[PDB]
Scaffold this active site. Structure first.
Site, PDB file in Angstrom:
ATOM      1  N   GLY A 507      40.943 -21.180  -0.427  1.00  0.00           N
ATOM      2  CA  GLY A 507      41.392 -22.456   0.062  1.00  0.00           C
ATOM      3  C   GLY A 507      41.629 -23.356  -1.161  1.00  0.00           C
ATOM      4  O   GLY A 507      40.899 -24.344  -1.281  1.00  0.00           O
ATOM      5  N   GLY A 510      39.543 -24.081  -4.955  1.00  0.00           N
ATOM      6  CA  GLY A 510      38.449 -23.175  -5.126  1.00  0.00           C
ATOM      7  C   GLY A 510      38.597 -21.766  -4.220  1.00  0.00           C
ATOM      8  O   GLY A 510      39.687 -21.431  -3.808  1.00  0.00           O
ATOM      9  N   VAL A 512      35.924 -18.826  -2.346  1.00  0.00           N
ATOM     10  CA  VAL A 512      34.708 -18.604  -1.416  1.00  0.00           C
ATOM     11  C   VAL A 512      34.387 -17.174  -1.518  1.00  0.00           C
ATOM     12  O   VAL A 512      35.116 -16.389  -0.884  1.00  0.00           O
ATOM     13  CB  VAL A 512      34.993 -19.258  -0.107  1.00  0.00           C
ATOM     14  CG1 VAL A 512      34.899 -20.713  -0.144  1.00  0.00           C
ATOM     15  CG2 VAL A 512      36.288 -18.546   0.588  1.00  0.00           C
ATOM     16  N   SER A 573      38.696 -16.592   9.986  1.00  0.00           N
ATOM     17  CA  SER A 573      39.442 -17.859  10.176  1.00  0.00           C
ATOM     18  C   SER A 573      40.333 -17.622  11.459  1.00  0.00           C
ATOM     19  O   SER A 573      40.162 -16.522  12.123  1.00  0.00           O
ATOM     20  CB  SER A 573      40.265 -17.950   8.957  1.00  0.00           C
ATOM     21  OG  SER A 573      41.054 -19.335   9.417  1.00  0.00           O
ATOM     22  N   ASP A 613      44.365 -32.395   6.461  1.00  0.00           N
ATOM     23  CA  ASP A 613      44.602 -31.177   6.054  1.00  0.00           C
ATOM     24  C   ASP A 613      44.241 -30.094   7.211  1.00  0.00           C
ATOM     25  O   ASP A 613      43.785 -29.042   6.910  1.00  0.00           O
ATOM     26  CB  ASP A 613      44.012 -30.725   4.787  1.00  0.00           C
ATOM     27  CG  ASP A 613      44.732 -29.622   4.125  1.00  0.00           C
ATOM     28  OD1 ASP A 613      46.015 -29.201   4.406  1.00  0.00           O
ATOM     29  OD2 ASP A 613      44.430 -29.216   3.176  1.00  0.00           O
TER      30      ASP A 613
HETATM   31  C1  LIG Z   1      38.617 -20.633   4.160  1.00  0.00           C
HETATM   32  C2  LIG Z   1      37.706 -19.780   4.651  1.00  0.00           C
HETATM   33  N1  LIG Z   1      36.292 -19.855   4.253  1.00  0.00           N
HETATM   34  C3  LIG Z   1      35.212 -19.190   4.868  1.00  0.00           C
HETATM   35  N2  LIG Z   1      35.434 -18.027   5.426  1.00  0.00           N
HETATM   36  C4  LIG Z   1      34.453 -17.460   5.944  1.00  0.00           C
HETATM   37  N3  LIG Z   1      34.662 -16.118   6.379  1.00  0.00           N
HETATM   38  C5  LIG Z   1      35.531 -15.138   6.663  1.00  0.00           C
HETATM   39  C6  LIG Z   1      36.937 -15.540   6.458  1.00  0.00           C
HETATM   40  C7  LIG Z   1      37.968 -14.793   6.637  1.00  0.00           C
HETATM   41  F1  LIG Z   1      39.297 -15.167   6.439  1.00  0.00           F
HETATM   42  C8  LIG Z   1      37.671 -13.384   6.768  1.00  0.00           C
HETATM   43  C9  LIG Z   1      38.693 -12.322   6.714  1.00  0.00           C
HETATM   44  O1  LIG Z   1      39.081 -11.890   7.774  1.00  0.00           O
HETATM   45  N4  LIG Z   1      39.194 -11.635   5.585  1.00  0.00           N
HETATM   46  C10 LIG Z   1      40.381 -10.705   5.610  1.00  0.00           C
HETATM   47  C11 LIG Z   1      40.792 -10.369   3.973  1.00  0.00           C
HETATM   48  O2  LIG Z   1      41.365 -11.423   3.462  1.00  0.00           O
HETATM   49  C12 LIG Z   1      40.297 -12.465   3.565  1.00  0.00           C
HETATM   50  C13 LIG Z   1      38.891 -12.081   4.163  1.00  0.00           C
HETATM   51  C14 LIG Z   1      36.322 -12.986   6.907  1.00  0.00           C
HETATM   52  C15 LIG Z   1      35.296 -14.114   6.751  1.00  0.00           C
HETATM   53  O3  LIG Z   1      34.112 -13.648   7.221  1.00  0.00           O
HETATM   54  C16 LIG Z   1      33.650 -12.118   7.308  1.00  0.00           C
HETATM   55  N5  LIG Z   1      33.200 -18.001   6.105  1.00  0.00           N
HETATM   56  C17 LIG Z   1      32.932 -19.188   5.421  1.00  0.00           C
HETATM   57  C18 LIG Z   1      34.103 -19.733   4.877  1.00  0.00           C
HETATM   58  C19 LIG Z   1      33.627 -21.062   4.189  1.00  0.00           C
HETATM   59  F2  LIG Z   1      34.515 -21.492   2.963  1.00  0.00           F
HETATM   60  F3  LIG Z   1      33.941 -22.191   5.055  1.00  0.00           F
HETATM   61  F4  LIG Z   1      32.350 -21.216   3.795  1.00  0.00           F
END
Ligand SMILES: CCNc1nc(Nc2cc(F)c(C(=O)N3CCOCC3)cc2OC)ncc1C(F)(F)F
Ligand SMILES: Nc1nc2c(ncn2[C@@H]2O[C@H](COP(=O)(O)OP(=O)(O)O)[C@@H](O)[C@H]2O)c(=O)[nH]1
Length: 1111
Positions: A507, A510, A512, A573, A613
Site C-alpha cells: 500500500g 510501505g 505489509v 482485500s 484515500d
Molecule cells: C493493503 C492490504 N493489507 C493487509 N492485507 C491483509 N490480508 C491479505 C490481503 C491480500 F490482498 C491477500 C491476497 O489475496 N493476495 C494475493 C496475491 O497478491 C497479494 C496477496 C491476502 C491477504 O491475507 C491472506 N491483511 C492485513 C493487511 C493490513 F495491511 F491492513 F494489515
C-alpha cells in the site's frame, strides 16, 4: 475580443508610515484607516495609444491587530508597494521585513515596488546599504525614496512601471491590460456596476439565480460554461468577490461590493480576557434580510459566545511555570524566520481542543493547565539576541507531559503542512537538553537527534561519557515514548521475514508482510528505507487513539525497524475478491461491506479526521460468511489528516477515487469531500469492480471520471442486477456541489434499512394508465411476464408487462371495465390460458401463445367480482354471489357452463374474497364471503359454515380472507381486521391498524389489501401507503413500511427467474396518477430482525471498545 485595462494596486502601509498620506498626495481628517479602504484612481498616460489605466487601489491598514485578516485579500495580478518611514532608520526596514516576507509567499509572481517616506527628516545614506542588501525576499524592482507631502517626487514612474508591467508583468506569458477578453465579460462588469447600486446598501450580495437571469435578460450572449470562468476573471481584476471554497460553503452567494467585506473586521472589532464576548446579536440590528446580515451565512466568516484573536492582548500575561528545573521539564523549539500573517490565529483555533482546564490565551501563545501534573506553554520567545523567531513548547518531564507534547507537535505540524506550505528549509526544529541540572540549555536540531536515538536511546555526552541522558525525557516524539503502554514492540516475541514469498499487499509508502506475534498471525507493516518518521506519526495519531469495530487495530509499534504490527485480514482485500471470487458477492454481503465502511467513515468524521484515500484496496475483509458482526474493516491511514470546520488545502488522492474538487486543488475541501469516495466505492461494489479494470487501461481515462464525471448507468451497461434503492445513493452522493451530498451519518442511516437489502426491482408504468387487478405467470420458466388489467379508460384493456424488459405492451381486447383475472396452467396439451372477469359480466379467454383464440365463455347472469384457478376448478364470483364452477376441460370450448351455480346470496350481497389454505393441502377448507357474511365450502359444493358478521366499521362487506390457522377478515374502510377461529366460529382478535400507525403519525389507515406468508408473518397493505409487516406469532410488529407510495392497490406473491419468494406490490401516486410496481423479497420479516440484531451487536462492541479505551 475587447480590450480591458484595469490593474489592481495594494499599498501595504505600516502604521505611522503615511500610506494614506502618500496615496492622497499621489492621487490629486486622516486620523487612521480602520481596515482596508479601497478606492479607484483614473489616469491617462502620455502615450497617445496608451490604454486607459485605472488602478483599483487598496489602502491597506497597517496596525498589527488587523494583520490576521489581511492575507485573504492579497491576491495575484497586482503591484504591491511598501511604505516604511525613514526617521526611524535601519530599524524601520527591519520592521517592514515581515510584510515583504509575507508577500513573498502569498503571491510571488507579483512585482514589488518599494518606496520610503518622509525624506524631510531622513538619513538615506545609512538605510541605502541595507535596502540594496534586501534585493525569500521577492523581486523588489526599484527603490524610490521620496518626499512626504509636497510635489518633488518622480514616483509617478509607478504609472510608467505599470504600463511596462502592462505587458512585462505576465500571468502565464500574457498581458494584464491586453487580454483580448470577450465583450460579454465587459457587459457582465457593466451590469455589475448597476447591480451594486440596486443591491441593498448594508447587505451587498446577489444569489446565483438572479445573475443567471440577468445574463440572458440583458442580451449578454454569455454561456453558462464560461460563466464561472467569467466570475473568476472579474474576481481577478477585483470588481466582485466569489468564494469557490467548498469548506466555506459560500459558493452560492456572490459579493458585488468588495468595498464592504474589508470593513467587517473593523465593525466587529468594537461590537475578563479578550476573545470572550456575548452572542452576535448585532446580526439583526441592520437591514439583514435573514437571521444575519445579507444571508444566514455571515457566521461562516473564516477571517454564539464570540472569540476573536485580533483583539487579544499583546503582553505576556502573569503566568509562572509551576516548576523550574532543567531536569523536570522538556522544551521544544521551532526556529522560523518570519511568523506568517495569520499564524497565531490558526494556532489558537486548532489548540482550542480540550480532549487529549484553566486557560490564558494571549495573542501569541495558548496555555492549557489541567493541574500541576501537565501544562503546555506554547509561546513565542524571541529573546535569543538573534534576528529570527522561536516558537517554544514547554512541558513537564512526566508521561502526562509526554502525551501532551507528542500531540501538540502533531497538530502544529499539521497546521504547517496544510495551511503554511512555504515554511517546509526555513523551519528548523530544536531540542533543549542539559546533562547537569542548573546549567543553561543546549540545543540540537531534530534531524540529528533522531539518528542519534535510532542508533541507541542512551544519548551520550560528547565531551565526557560520564554523563548520560535518555532520549525519552529530551525528545519523546522520536522514540515513540508518548504512546499508551499497551502498544509497544517486543522484538524478542516477533519472527517476521522480509522474504518475497511471505508478502501481502503493497500500500503505497510501505509494504505489509505476514508474520507471527505472540503465536497468532499478524501483518507487520515495515516501512521503506526512504520514509520519514512524520508518516509514522501521521498513522499513529489515528491508529493509537481511535477504537471502532470497523477500523483496523494496532498490536505494537516500535522505532527500531519502524514497523506497525496490525491484525491480519485473512479473507483478502476487496479488490482481490472483486476480481477472482466474483460469485461470492451476494446481495447481503454487498450491503454489509458498504454498511461497515460507512460506519467507519462516520466514526472517523466524528473525530475530526478525513480519510481522503477510500480506495477499494483499503477495504479489508475478515470472513465472507454473510451473517457475522465484523466483516469489513478499513486500513492504510497514511494520509489521514485532522480536519476541523475550516477545511484542508492539500490535494492527495489516487487518480479516479477523488472528489471533483480534490483534483482541482485550488479550492479547500472539507469532510464532505469524502462521501464522494464512498459513493465511488459503492459504484465499484454494485458492478463487481468492472470500472476498476476499465480504468486500469489508461490513467487519463481513470482520472477523467473524477474531473469530467460522465459515469454510465450501472444497471444498463455493466450488467448488474437492478438495486433500485441504493441507486438513489450512487445518483445522490456523486454530485458536483459538495453541499448537496448526504453527510456521512445520513448515508449510514439510509444504509441501515431492511428495505434497501430488499426492494429488488421497481417499475413505473406510463403516465396516467392505471391497474386494478394483477395476475402473475404460473409457468415461471418461459419468461417474466405479468398481465395487468387496466381500468383507466371506459373500455377495458389487457396489458402485459414483461418484468425483465420493462416493455409495456398493452392491448385493448375488452369492452367494459376489467375487474378480475386468472391464469389456468395445464401442462396437458400445453394449455396456458388467461381468463378475465369484466364489470359487464363476461368471461373473456385468451391464450398466451395464440394471438387470437378468444373463446368467450357463457356470460354469467350479472357482473364478475373474482375468479380462482391437483384441482383445476374455476370458481367465479358474481356481484349477486351466485358462485359458478367452470372446468379446465372446457378451455377450448367457446361458451359453456360446465357445472351448476351454487347460489348463496342475492344481488345485494357482493362476493369477492375467494381463497384457499396452505394447511393440509386439502382444498376442501376453501373459505370466503358473500356480502356482509363469511362462509366456507368444500369439493362437495356444500356450505359447511355460514357465519354472519352483522355485529361503526362493523357493518361493511367482506374484501379478503386468508386461512392458515385462523381467519383474517378485512372490510371496506376498516381500521380493524376482525379475526376469527375456524373451530369455535367466534371472533377472537381485533388487530387495530391505526393504533399501530399512531407510532408513525379522520385517519386514512384503511385496509385495501392483505396477504399471508407461509408461516412467518402477515403483509397488511394499507390504502394510506403503508405495509404493516405484522408478525404472525401473536401480536408483534416487525416494521411498518412507507415513503415510497401513496396508496397500495393490490399485493400478492409471485416467482421470478425460476426462483420463488417475490412480493409484487401495485401502488398509486396520488389528478396525476403514476402507477408503480415494486417487487419486494419476502425474506423481509426475517431481515428486519437479523439486521437489527446485527446492528445492536456491533453497537455494543463499539461501546465496549470506546469505553474501555478511556482507561
Ligand atoms: C493493503 C492490504 N493489507 C493487509 N492485507 C491483509 N490480508 C491479505 C490481503 C491480500 F490482498 C491477500 C491476497 O489475496 N493476495 C494475493 C496475491 O497478491 C497479494 C496477496 C491476502 C491477504 O491475507 C491472506 N491483511 C492485513 C493487511 C493490513 F495491511 F491492513 F494489515
Ligand atoms: N511622520 C509623518 N507622519 C505623517 C505625515 N503626514 C501624515 N502622517 C501620518 O500618517 C498617517 C497615515 O498613515 P496610515 O497608513 O493611514 O496608518 P494606518 O491608518 O494605521 O494604516 C496619518 O494619520 C498621519 O498622522 C508626515 O509628513 N510625517
Amino acid at each position: 475580443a475587447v480590450p480591458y485595462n484595469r490593474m489592481k494596486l495594494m499599498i501595504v502601509g505600516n502604521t505611522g508610515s503615511g500610506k494614506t498620506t502618500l496615496l492622497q498626495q499621489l492621487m490629486k481628517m486622516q486620523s487612521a484607516t480602520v481596515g482596508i479602504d479601497v478606492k479607484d484612481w483614473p489616469i491617462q498616460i502620455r502615450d497617445k495609444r496608451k490604454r486607459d489605466l485605472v488602478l483599483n487601489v487598496w489602502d491597506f491598514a497597517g496596525r498589527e491587530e488587523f494583520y490576521s485578516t489581511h492575507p485573504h485579500f492579497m491576491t495575484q495580478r497586482a503591484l504591491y508597494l511598501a511604505v516604511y518611514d525613514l526617521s526611524k532608520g535601519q530599524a524601520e526596514v527591519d520592521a517592514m521585513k515581515p510584510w515583504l516576507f509575507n508577500i513573498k509567499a502569498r503571491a510571488s509572481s507579483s512585482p514589488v515596488i518599494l518606496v520610503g517616506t518622509h525624506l524631510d527628516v531622513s538619513d538615506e545614506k545609512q538605510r541605502k546599504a541595507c535596502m540594496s542588501k534586501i534585493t525569500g525576499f521577492p523581486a523588489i524592482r526599484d527603490y524610490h525614496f521620496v518626499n512626504a507631502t509636497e510635489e518633488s517626487d518622480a514616483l509617478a514612474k509607478l504609472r510608467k512601471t505599470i504600463i511596462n508591467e502592462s505587458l512585462n508583468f505576465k500571468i502565464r506569458d500574457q498581458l494584464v491590460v491586453g487580454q483580448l477578453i470577450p465583450d460579454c465579460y465587459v457587459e457582465l462588469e457593466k451590469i455589475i456596476l448597476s447591480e451594486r447600486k440596486n443591491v441593498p446598501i448594508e447587505f451587498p450580495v446577489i444569489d446565483r439565480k438572479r445573475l443567471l437571469q440577468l445574463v440572458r435578460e440583458n442580451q449578454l450572449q454569455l454561456d453558462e460554461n464560461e460563466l464561472p470562468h467569467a466570475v473568476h476573471f472579474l474576481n481577478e481584476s477585483g470588481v466582485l468577490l466569489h468564494f469557490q471554497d467548498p469548506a466555506l460553503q459560500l459558493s452560492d452567494l456572490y459579493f458585488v461590493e468588495p468595498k464592504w467585506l474589508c470593513k467587517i473586521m473593523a465593525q466587529i472589532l468594537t461590537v475578563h480576557p479578550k476573545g470572550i464576548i456575548s452572542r452576535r446579536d448585532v446580526e439583526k440590528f441592520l437591514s439583514k434580510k435573514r437571521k444575519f446580515p445579507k444571508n444566514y451565512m455571515t457566521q461562516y466568516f473564516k477571517l454564539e459566545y464570540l472569540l476573536v484573536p485580533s483583539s487579544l492582548s499583546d503582553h505576556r500575561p502573569v503566568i509562572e511555570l509551576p516548576h523550574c528545573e532543567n531536569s523536570e521539564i522538556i522544551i521544544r523549539l521551532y526556529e522560523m524566520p518570519y511568523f506568517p500573517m495569520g499564524f497565531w490565529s490558526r494556532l489558537i483555533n486548532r489548540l482550542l481542543e480540550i480532549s487529549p482546564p484553566n486557560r490564558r490565551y494571549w495573542r501569541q501563545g495558548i496555555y492549557l493547565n489541567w493541574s500541576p501534573e501537565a501544562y503546555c506553554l506554547v509561546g513565542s520567545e524571541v529573546l535569543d539576541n538573534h534576528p529570527e523567531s522561536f516558537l517554544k513548547i514547554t512541558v513537564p518531564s512526566c508521561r502526562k507531559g509526554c502525551i501532551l507534547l507528542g500531540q501538540v507537535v502533531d497538530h502544529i505540524d499539521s497546521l504547517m503542512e496544510e495551511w503554511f506550505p512555504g515554511l517546509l528549509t526555513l523551519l528548523k526544529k530544536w531540542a533543549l537538553y542539559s546533562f547537569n541540572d542548573g546549567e543553561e540549555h543546549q540545543k540540537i536540531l531534530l534531524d540529528d537527534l533522531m539518528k542519534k536515538a535510532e542508533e541507541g536511546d542512551l544519548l551520550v555526552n560528547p565531551d565526557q561519557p560520564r554523563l548520560t541522558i535518555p532520549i525519552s525525557q529530551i525528545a519523546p516524539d522520536l522514540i515513540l515514548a508518548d504512546l499508551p503502554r499497551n502498544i509497544m514492540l517486543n522484538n524478542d516475541e516477533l519472527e517476521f521475514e522480509q522474504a518475497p514469498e511471505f508478502l501481502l499487499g503493497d500500500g503505497s509508502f510501505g509494504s505489509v508482510y505476514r508474520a507471527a506475534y505472540e503465536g497468532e498471525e499478524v501483518a507487520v507493516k515495515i516501512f521503506n528505507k526512504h520514509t520519514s518518521l512524520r508518516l509514522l506519526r501521521q498513522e499513529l495519531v489515528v491508529l493509537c487513539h481511535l477504537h471502532h469495530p470497523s477500523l483496523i487495530s494496532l498490536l505494537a509499534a516500535g522505532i527500531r525497524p519502524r514497523m506497525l504490527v496490525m491484525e491480519l485480514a485473512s479473507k483478502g482485500s476487496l479488490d482481490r475478491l472483486l476480481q477472482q471470487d466474483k460469485a461470492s458477492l451476494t446481495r447481503t454481503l454487498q450491503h454489509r461491506i458498504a454498511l461497515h465502511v460507512a460506519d467507519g467513515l462516520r466514526y472517523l468524521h466524528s473525530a475530526m479526521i478525513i480519510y481522503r484515500d477510500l480506495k477499494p484496496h483499503n477495504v479489508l475483509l475478515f470472513t465472507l460468511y454473510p451473517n457475522a458482526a465484523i466483516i469489513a474493516k478499513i486500513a492504510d491511514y497514511g494520509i489521514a489528516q485532522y480536519c476541523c470546520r475550516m477545511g484542508i488545502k492539500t490535494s492527495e488522492g489516487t487518480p479516479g477515487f477523488r472528489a471533483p474538487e480534490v483534483a482541482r486543488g485550488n479550492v479547500i475541501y472539507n469532510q464532505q469531500a469524502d462521501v464522494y469516495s464512498f459513493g465511488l466505492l459503492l459504484y465499484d461494489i454494485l458492478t463487481t469492480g468492472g470500472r476498476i479494470v476499465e480504468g486500469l487501461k489508461f490513467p487519463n481515462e481513470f482520472d477523467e471520471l473524477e474531473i469530467q464525471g460522465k459515469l454510465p448507468d450501472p444497471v444498463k451497461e455493466y450488467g448488474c442486477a437492478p438495486w433500485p434503492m441504493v441507486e438513489k445513493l450512487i445518483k445522490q452522493c456523486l454530485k458536483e456541489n459538495p453541499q448537496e451530498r448526504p453527510t456521512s451519518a445520513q448515508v449510514f442511516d439510509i444504509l441501515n434499512s431492511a428495505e434497501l437489502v430488499c426492494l429488488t426491482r421497481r417499475i413505473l408504468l406510463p403516465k396516467n394508465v392505471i391497474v386494478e387487478c394483477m395476475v402473475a405467470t404460473h409457468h415461471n420458466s418461459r419468461n417474466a411476464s405479468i398481465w395487468l388489467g387496466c381500468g383507466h379508460t371506459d373500455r377495458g384493456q389487457l396489458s402485459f408487462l414483461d418484468l425483465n424488459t420493462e416493455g409495456y405492451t398493452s392491448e385493448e381486447v375488452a369492452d367494459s371495465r376489467i375487474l378480475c383475472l386468472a391464469l389456468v396452467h395445464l401442462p396437458v396439451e400445453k394449455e396456458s390460458w388467461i381468463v378475465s372477469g369484466t364489470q359487464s359480466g363476461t368471461l373473456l379467454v385468451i391464450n398466451t401463445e395464440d394471438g387470437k383464440k378468444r373463446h368467450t365463455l357463457e356470460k354469467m347472469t350479472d357482473s364478475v367480482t373474482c375468479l380462482y384457478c391437483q384441482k383445476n376448478f374455476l370458481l367465479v364470483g358474481t356481484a349477486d354471489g351466485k358462485l359458478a364452477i367452470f372446468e379446465d376441460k372446457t378451455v377450448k370450448l367457446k361458451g359453456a357452463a360446465p357445472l351448476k351455480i351454487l347460489n348463496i346470496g342475492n344481488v345485494s350481497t357482493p362476493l369477492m374474497c375467494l381463497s384457499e389454505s396452505t394447511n393440509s393441502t386439502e382444498r376442501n377448507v376453501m373459505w370466503g364471503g358473500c356480502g356482509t357474511k363469511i362462509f366456507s365450502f368444500s369439493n362437495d359444493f356444500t356450505i359447511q359454515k355460514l357465519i354472519e358478521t352483522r355485529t361503526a366499521f362493523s357493518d361493511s362487506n367482506i374484501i379478503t380472507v386468508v386461512v392458515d390457522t385462523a381467519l383474517y377478515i378485512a372490510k371496506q374502510n376498516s381500521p380493524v381486521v376482525e379475526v376469527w377461529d375456524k373451530k369455535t366460529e367466534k371472533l377472537c382478535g381485533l388487530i387495530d391498524c391505526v393504533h399501530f400507525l399512531r407510532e408513525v403519525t379522520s385517519y386514512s389507515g384503511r385496509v385495501k389489501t392483505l396477504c399471508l406468508q407461509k408461516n412467518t408473518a402477515l403483509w397488511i397493505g394499507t390504502g394510506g401507503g403503508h405495509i404493516l409487516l405484522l408478525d404472525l406469532s401473536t401480536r408483534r410488529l416487525i416494521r411498518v413500511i412507507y415513503n415510497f407510495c401513496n396508496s397500495v392497490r393490490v399485493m400478492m406473491t409471485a416467482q421470478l427467474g425460476s426462483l420463488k419468494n417475490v412480493m409484487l406490490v401495485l401502488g398509486y401516486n396520488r389528478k396525476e396518477i403514476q402507477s408503480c410496481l415494486t417487487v419486494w423479497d419476502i425474506n423481509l420479516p426475517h431481515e428486519v430482525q437479523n439486521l437489527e440484531k446485527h446492528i445492536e451487536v456491533r453497537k455494543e462492541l463499539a461501546e465496549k471498545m470506546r469505553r474501555t479505551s478511556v482507561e
